[PDB]
Amino acid sequence: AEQVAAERAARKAANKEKRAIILERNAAYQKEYETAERNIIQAKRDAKAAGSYYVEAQHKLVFVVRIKGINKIPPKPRKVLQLLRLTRINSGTFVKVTKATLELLKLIEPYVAYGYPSYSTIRQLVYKRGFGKINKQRVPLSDNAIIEANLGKYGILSIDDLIHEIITVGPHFKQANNFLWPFKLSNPSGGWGVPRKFKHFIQGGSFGNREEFINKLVKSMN
Amino acid sequence: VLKKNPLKNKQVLLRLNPYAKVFAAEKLGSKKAEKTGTKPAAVFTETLKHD
Amino acid sequence: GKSHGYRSRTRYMFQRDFRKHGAVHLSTYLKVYKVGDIVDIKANGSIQKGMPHKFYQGKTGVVYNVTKSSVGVIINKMVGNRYLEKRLNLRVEHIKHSKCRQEFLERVKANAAKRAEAKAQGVAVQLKRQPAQPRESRIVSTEGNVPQTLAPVPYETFI
Amino acid sequence: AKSKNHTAHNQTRKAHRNGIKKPKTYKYPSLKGVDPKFRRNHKHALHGTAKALAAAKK
Amino acid sequence: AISKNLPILKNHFRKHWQERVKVHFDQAGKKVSRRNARATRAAKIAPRP
Amino acid sequence: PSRFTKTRKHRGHVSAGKGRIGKHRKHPGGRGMAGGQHHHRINMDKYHPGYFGKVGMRYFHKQQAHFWKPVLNLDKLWTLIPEDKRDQYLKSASKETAPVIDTLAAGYGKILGKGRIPNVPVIVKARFVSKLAEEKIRAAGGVVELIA
Amino acid sequence: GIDHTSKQHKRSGHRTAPKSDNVYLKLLVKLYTFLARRTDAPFNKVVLKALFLSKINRPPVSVSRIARALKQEGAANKTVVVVGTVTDDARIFEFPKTTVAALRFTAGARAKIVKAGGECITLDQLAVRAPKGQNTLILRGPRNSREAVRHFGMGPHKGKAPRILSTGRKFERARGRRRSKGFKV
RNA sequence: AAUUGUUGAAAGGGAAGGGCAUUUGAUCA
RNA sequence: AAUACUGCCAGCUGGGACUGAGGACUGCGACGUAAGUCAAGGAUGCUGGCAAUGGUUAUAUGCCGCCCGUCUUGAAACACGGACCAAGGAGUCUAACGUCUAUGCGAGUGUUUGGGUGUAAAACCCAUACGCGUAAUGAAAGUGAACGUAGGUUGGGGCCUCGCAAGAGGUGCACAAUCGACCGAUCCUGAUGUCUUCGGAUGGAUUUGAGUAAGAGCAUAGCUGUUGGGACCCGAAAGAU
RNA sequence: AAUAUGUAAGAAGUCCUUGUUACUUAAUUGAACGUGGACAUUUGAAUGAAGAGCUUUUAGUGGGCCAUUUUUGGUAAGCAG
RNA sequence: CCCUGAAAAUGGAUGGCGCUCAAGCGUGUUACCUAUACUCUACCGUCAGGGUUGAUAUGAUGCCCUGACGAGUAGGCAGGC
């Protein structure tokens, strides 16, 4: 019984090959991100310069957090919240923007705050409070092996791949979002910034759509 | 047995993202953009301050 | 006392439409009804034989029986905390076809046609429908469309 | 000594505690309420096709 | 008095039945006494059966 | 029994498992079968239909001896014969020598046709026989003897 | 707090380990638990689950039923497995050779199998011969054939064996069962 | 045990009694 | 050009509080060409003091704190009982049962009505009868369940074969619905024969049953529920001898 | 109008050929049940699901009140509905 | 905004003390304190998903791993003195 070293060496070789593929894919994703951001910036610049206005495409991904307790909730909004996986206060989920999802959010707007997330806050959320759902259990994600095992059928095998699927909605965004447990955030470190949370954002509260302002609140709560 | 947080433990960050070493080496977090310059059209310039 | 009859509180329900009284157009009697077809129920006031009840007005059901001039409809009625099936025989007059099922057969035929044509080469059939996706990027040109400045109007006391 | 007559409060919650269930559907539905002549001819046709299938494939 | 899906039972205990309860606690004693009486009779009646 | 009785666990609870709004009073619905057409009519119609009313005529002094007609189906016909000879008479299927069963002596007064008895000669004696049973026995090759 | 969508701390609703205190039954349950845990054949898991069934959930299986099951195509050379008791049927006359494994065997059924040419083995022997349940066929008796299930679900227009003690005339045959005395059921 | 008398200890601006934590007094491995 | 504002850093670093769970190695990573090392699936090293910390109780301090049990939508109430302690005190038993569970036997099942025996109300043994089930339907007379591999079809665990796997084919116990076959009652039609009025073969039903369709039952014990009994305990104004 | 509400968004499906009937049609003309045969990436809108379905037993319950909105009787009511 | 309209019976209520470029009134911006609320950790119990007869070694109703939850009258079940 001396083959333990042979299996050890084979495991190391396989791990090194896997790490090489992961590094190549991560470099490709970073290059794509930089290219896309620069392309949008220059497109806005040329539209401004050519006597025109650049109408940005509507954001396809939003982050929704629950800012209301589980008491005094009407049954239809309560059911919508359960279907959207918001059963604890200060719980957040990612949502792909469609007509059905927009009408769903319009119903439980009074009890949630949602807005367009950014790559930095998405990465921070996934790194810090990123938890998976394996065998109906909340197993923390501290290695790419678990992610590859539970998501390799969809072409996702690393935490960076999962973050990429979250930020850019693709063919397997539904499964990528379903694999992730809803993020249990804490109260904001710097406070909510308003005297009354249960008022609309235009009316001076946390209730309602915050658009790009959701990033600051999410990072404060995370 | 215990969850260690990325972005605070360099070993765990490097284990999760092998590209982190290359990112730190190339300083991709602070990259200077191309020094291109375009001038807005007179129509937009006047519409900005048209009262 | 109290009154809850077979035609109670149907004054505006079992009533013919404005300028649509008289006999029934000879098109309903020419419709062919088969077992399994989905039909809607709409009572007609001119014919008082085989009229449906108030609850079954506007409900949609499958056809399970064919008779001389009548068809049987299975309607799921919610009583208590369960749905119970109800087999009710109604005349042809107070029953019309449902276009949602016809749209479903049309979509199925187009679905199969696309499954044949696209898969003849085998690339991105995408046979499934999608909701209203967010609009992509667009560029607007102010060539003859200079934005006009708008300001709120003063309050007026017109009578 | 008068008392409350009728109220529908909490009835919806009571009915929804045990979720309202759609009736269980089967491939072969009940053949009751169907035209007796059609049922008789269906029985005859079923016997005929069963005999034909038994004679053809064994 | 009347309840869910249970059978109908006809219990005939409505008079002063508590005063007329006969419990045969002396089954073994009666058997022993009968055997002793049989032996005594057999001895008395001579070898006759 | 007493140790496993729920009263011991109910000790301490004020109502002792009988409720507070409605206490465990005496018979509130009546004694015995009080009410079968007034207030318990719903249960008496949905669980015990047919309790109230008369059905047939009257048979005074009905002795349960004239109706003593025990039944015995055809499948359980060879069980009356002892096992030690049952196999022998099963393999010996000849008309000149066949096993004989006395159903009256066995305690059965009527024989019914059900079981598809094996095609062997046999003799059966019974007070009453059925048409199907007799036809099956004669088709097998046996005969039915009428005894009293 | 959590707006629970389901009952908290709810049991699975299935019976784990037998409720009986039969030492041999517990030993057999332990053996089949070991098998089903360290093997991959679903037969071991099915047998282990059936071992927890109650008396009413474990109806007897007759030798006639065994013969009928073995009469199927390709089932002649198969090992019959009955999780329960195997009874003897006198309505059958020809019993083919087989191999039946069951917990308890009726004396008449065992004699019938021995005379036919088969053998009566236990679940432990069945496991020893076929650890993965190869070439086996599981037989279960009729569960809804009990006399206590006829009375279940009694209601109007159902005909579900009303709970009675005596049978005959003037015993729940009056008004409520005939159209001449009012309504029929 | 309820109740009562002495000895020894403590508290007592129109009640006593309890919980959250500690100082002080008595006692304790 | 600089600056204000917003967003990013897989940029660095200063200060403070809580926590030390796990117990020879197993995995994922980094540094190091390589030995080996590491902040890498949960804290170690060094040093100081004592051999006081801490547990129980009384008082004191800061805050909080309405009287136990019942009725009630609403109790602390100016609603009800309680001055205290000690002793007793309230869902028990019988007969027939319903669901479930356990045991034994099993188309059979139950010794203890009784007899023999007995270390003597203990324990052991036993023949015929009898209770329930194996056949039910009609008021009754009466009759009485395989055209079939005990039917056809769907869903169906398991098993077998092919298949690297996945998947494909066959058989498919149990169970769900439906269509069929047979038995009893009712409505009908009516084959030979004949004590001319008896006999009821064969073919059907939008009819009907607490049926058959390879039996599942019997005995005892246990939780809970119902009935009758005084019936969880206590209490009437009354009636009769 | 808004709100509220029913049905459909597929393998129990679609399509090709043809076996049965005592139904029906002038009629292999229609209806039902079928046999054989073709369509598994993307099984036919989005989301979710400590899994879903089914059976038995039974304790307690059958005097309610209050809050936003709609609203009846009453001038109003911590009034009744 | 303030003033007259504006009067009820024991002595009293923005809680009172009190407050006048307010400590009163409307609005705009930061910092500060806290719920048995939220995030993490330590322990207990319950449930779910599993590993552990290759042993001397016993309690596989035993041991261990991971995840989630823990209110409550009448009432039910289970484990214990």
UniProtKB/Swiss-Prot annotation, chain B:
UniProt family annotation: Belongs to the universal ribosomal protein uL4 family.
Gene: RPL4A
Cited function: Component of the ribosome, a large ribonucleoprotein complex responsible for the synthesis of proteins in the cell. The small ribosomal subunit (SSU) binds messenger RNAs (mRNAs) and translates the encoded message by selecting cognate aminoacyl-transfer RNA (tRNA) molecules. The large subunit (LSU) contains the ribosomal catalytic site termed the peptidyl transferase center (PTC), which catalyzes the formation of peptide bonds, thereby polymerizing the amino acids delivered by tRNAs into a polypeptide chain.
Identification of the protein by name: Large ribosomal subunit protein uL4A
Post-translation changes: N-terminally acetylated by acetyltransferase NatA.
Domain notes per entry: The eukaryote-specific C-terminal extension harbors a nuclear import signal and delivers the ACL4-uL4/RPL4 complex to the pre-ribosome, triggering uL4 release from ACL4 and incorporation into the 60S ribosomal subunit.
Source organism: Saccharomyces cerevisiae (strain ATCC 204508 / S288c) (Baker's yeast)
Superkingdom field: Eukaryota
Additional comment: There are 2 genes for uL4 in yeast.
Organismal lineage: Eukaryota, Fungi, Dikarya, Ascomycota, Saccharomycotina
Subcellular location: Cytoplasm; Nucleus
Curated annotation (Swiss-Prot), chain C:
Gene Ontology terms for molecular function: structural constituent of ribosome
Subunit structure of this chain's protein: Component of the large ribosomal subunit (LSU). Mature yeast ribosomes consist of a small (40S) and a large (60S) subunit. The 40S small subunit contains 1 molecule of ribosomal RNA (18S rRNA) and 33 different proteins (encoded by 57 genes). The large 60S subunit contains 3 rRNA molecules (25S, 5.8S and 5S rRNA) and 46 different proteins (encoded by 81 genes).
Keyword Ribosomal protein: yes
GO cellular component, one term: cytosol
Keyword presence, Mitochondrion: no
Top-level taxon of the source organism: Eukaryota
Name of this chain's protein: Large ribosomal subunit protein eL21A
Swiss-Prot/TrEMBL keywords: Cytoplasm, Isopeptide bond, Ribonucleoprotein, Ribosomal protein, Ubl conjugation
Alphabetized Pfam families for the sequence: Ribosomal_L21e
Cross-link (Glycyl lysine isopeptide (Lys-Gly) (interchain with G-Cter in ubiquitin)): K31
One of the protein's GO biological processes: cytoplasmic translation
More info: There are 2 genes for eL21 in yeast.
Similarity section: Belongs to the eukaryotic ribosomal protein eL21 family.
Subcellular location: Cytoplasm
InterPro entries the UniProt entry points to: Ribosomal_eL21 (IPR001147), Ribosomal_eL21_CS (IPR018259), Ribosomal_eL21_sf (IPR036948), Translation_prot_SH3-like_sf (IPR008991)
Gene3D superfamilies xref list: 6.10.250.3260, Ribosomal protein L21
Bridged cysteine pairs (disulfide): none
Curated annotation (Swiss-Prot), chain F:
Positions of crosslink type Glycyl lysine isopeptide (Lys-Gly) (interchain with G-Cter in ubiquitin): K95
Superkingdom of origin organism: Eukaryota
Locations listed in the record: Cytoplasm
Keywords: Cytoplasm, Isopeptide bond, Ribonucleoprotein, Ribosomal protein, Ubl conjugation
Motif Nuclear localization signal: where in chain: 6-12, 23-29
Effect of Q37E: Confers resistance to cycloheximide, an inhibitor of polypeptide elongation
Compositional bias per record (Basic residues), positions renumbered to this chain: 1-13, 20-29
Any one GO MF annotation of this record: structural constituent of ribosome
Keyword Ribonucleoprotein: yes
Biological processes annotated in GO: cytoplasmic translation
Cited InterPro entries: Ribosomal_uL15, Ribosomal_uL15/eL18, Ribosomal_uL15/eL18_sf, Ribosomal_uL15_CS
Keyword Protease in annotation: no
Region (Disordered): 1-38
Chain segments annotated as transmembrane: none
Short name of one Pfam family: Ribosomal_L27A
Protein family membership: Belongs to the universal ribosomal protein uL15 family.
Quaternary structure note: Component of the large ribosomal subunit (LSU). Mature yeast ribosomes consist of a small (40S) and a large (60S) subunit. The 40S small subunit contains 1 molecule of ribosomal RNA (18S rRNA) and 33 different proteins (encoded by 57 genes). The large 60S subunit contains 3 rRNA molecules (25S, 5.8S and 5S rRNA) and 46 different proteins (encoded by 81 genes).
Protein name (Swiss-Prot/TrEMBL): Large ribosomal subunit protein uL15
Species lineage: Eukaryota, Fungi, Dikarya, Ascomycota, Saccharomycotina
From Swiss-Prot, chain G:
Pfam families registered for this protein in UniProt: Ribosomal_L18 (PF17135)
PROSITE patterns hit by this protein: RIBOSOMAL_L18E (PS01106)
Listed InterPro entries: Ribosomal_eL18, Ribosomal_eL18/eL18-A/B/_CS, Ribosomal_uL15/eL18, Ribosomal_uL15/eL18_sf
Covalent link (Glycyl lysine isopeptide (Lys-Gly) (interchain with G-Cter in ubiquitin)) residue numbers: K115
Protein's UniProt keywords contain Cytoplasm: yes
GO CC terms, sorted: cytosol; cytosolic large ribosomal subunit
Keywords per UniProt: Cytoplasm, Isopeptide bond, Methylation, Ribonucleoprotein, Ribosomal protein, Ubl conjugation
Domain of life: Eukaryota
Biological process according to GO: cytoplasmic translation
GO molecular function: RNA binding; structural constituent of ribosome
Main localization (coarse): cytoplasm
N6,N6,N6-trimethyllysine sites (modified residues): K49
Compartment(s): Cytoplasm
Further remarks about this protein from its record: There are 2 genes for eL18 in yeast.
Family: Belongs to the eukaryotic ribosomal protein eL18 family.
Subunit structure: Component of the large ribosomal subunit (LSU). Mature yeast ribosomes consist of a small (40S) and a large (60S) subunit. The 40S small subunit contains 1 molecule of ribosomal RNA (18S rRNA) and 33 different proteins (encoded by 57 genes). The large 60S subunit contains 3 rRNA molecules (25S, 5.8S and 5S rRNA) and 46 different proteins (encoded by 81 genes). eL18 interacts with NAP1.
Protein name listed in UniProt: Large ribosomal subunit protein eL18A
Taxonomic lineage from the root: Eukaryota, Fungi, Dikarya, Ascomycota, Saccharomycotina
